[PDB]
């Protein structure tokens, strides 16, 4: 069956249109999660190259970055019982669940250190959550299945791989964090023939 | 070590330029300055997107804007290869990178196609322009008979998807969609590997 890359091309174009109306963070997340919902509902477009689990670390595959680094679209792929560290973003983010099962535990900086702010959010294909400095920026995403891999498409208000942000230890101390990317090549979504 | 930052900085600068909603005259003038800065140094283009094919000239997409405002393409000619006579129907900038190639501009006359001028002889660093306004029809071809030739083309669209035309000797249009030779683009956005 032929890969429907047009889905990703159309998402990027729509998200470009959105950010050229110079909107506020409240409106970007509200309309953005609608567009990301439309993308991750169908699992027939992500090239197999950017769905591959590594057995040592979770993989971060860049799919597209805006010319002006306004935004970026990244495929995160967790192998069985893998996890991100506790981390912030320092920009608006949208996590769209695509394949498998993973949980997102939100965190807050308290006196004692890190305190989990709420119950682990349980994501199934199609579900879209948000993160930002304004609404709650610290979390930990991890694969719920112990045998299957899990994939989600993340969208950020920057080139997320180059952002100077932080991971957090139990006592609540920051360490500098630049995530980078797992791929040396992006997919060509622009050949409409 | 590949200086991909050069291409990242060009794309960002060209993004800034087009968000000031400038006229075609100003885009070409400031654009050819930025493209000049890129193609003067030949230490950034990944080898994967510099490969000649022995049958047809290769068109490798390096970057496309989110809104399809512009695209940056590596064109690679093998020995004694050539494009057909073609138009663009958008503003274009051809930056010469490696080897030697000539660009013969054309005009549609009564008899058909007549070459409008002498073949423009491009050497590494040289930047020319094309558009409907200033002269849209040309033919780019490798001047060397043994070396390959490469130039970085920048267009005011996603050039591979534009419905444009090739031209035959008698001057008759055939529809033309060029597409791209590559299934993968280079990742110019991982700054943490420097
Ligand atoms: Cl506390
Ligand atoms: Cl003409
Ligand atoms: Fe995150
Ligand atoms: Fe051309």
Author numbering:
A (entry chain C): 4 to 196
B (entry chain B): 5 to 198
From the paper:
Because intrinsic structural differences between Av3MDO and Pa3MDO are expected to be small owing to their high sequence similarity, we considered the possibility that the observed active site differences could arise from the bound substrate mimetic in Av3MDO. To test this hypothesis, we identified alternative crystallization conditions to allow investigation of the resting-state structure of Av3MDO. Following further sparse matrix screening, we identified a crystallization condition containing a nonpolyacrylate precipitant (pentaerythritol propoxylate) as well as sodium thiocyanate that produced yellowish, rod-shaped crystals. The crystals diffracted X-rays to ∼3 Å resolution and belonged to space group P6122 with a pair of dimers (same conserved interface described above) in the asymmetric unit. Strong difference density in the equatorial positions of the iron center was adequately explained by two water molecules while the axial position contained an elongated difference peak that was too strong to represent only water or chloride. Placement of thiocyanate, a well-known Fe(III)-binding ligand present at > 0.3 M concentration in the crystal mother liquor, at this position adequately accounted for the density with reasonable refined B-factors. Analysis of difference maps and refined B-factors provided strong evidence that coordination is through the nitrogen atom, which is consistent with the coordination preferences of Fe(III), a hard Lewis acid, and small-molecule crystallography results for high-spin, nonheme iron model compounds. Contrary to our hypothesis, we observed that the active site has maintained its closed state in this new crystal form. By contrast, the conformation of Trp81 is identical in every copy within the asymmetric units of the two Av3MDO structures, suggesting it represents an intrinsic structural difference as compared with Pa3MDO. A notable finding from our structural analysis of Av3MDO was its lack of a patent tunnel for substrate diffusion to the active site. This observation was consist across all crystallographically independent protomers of both Av3MDO crystal forms.
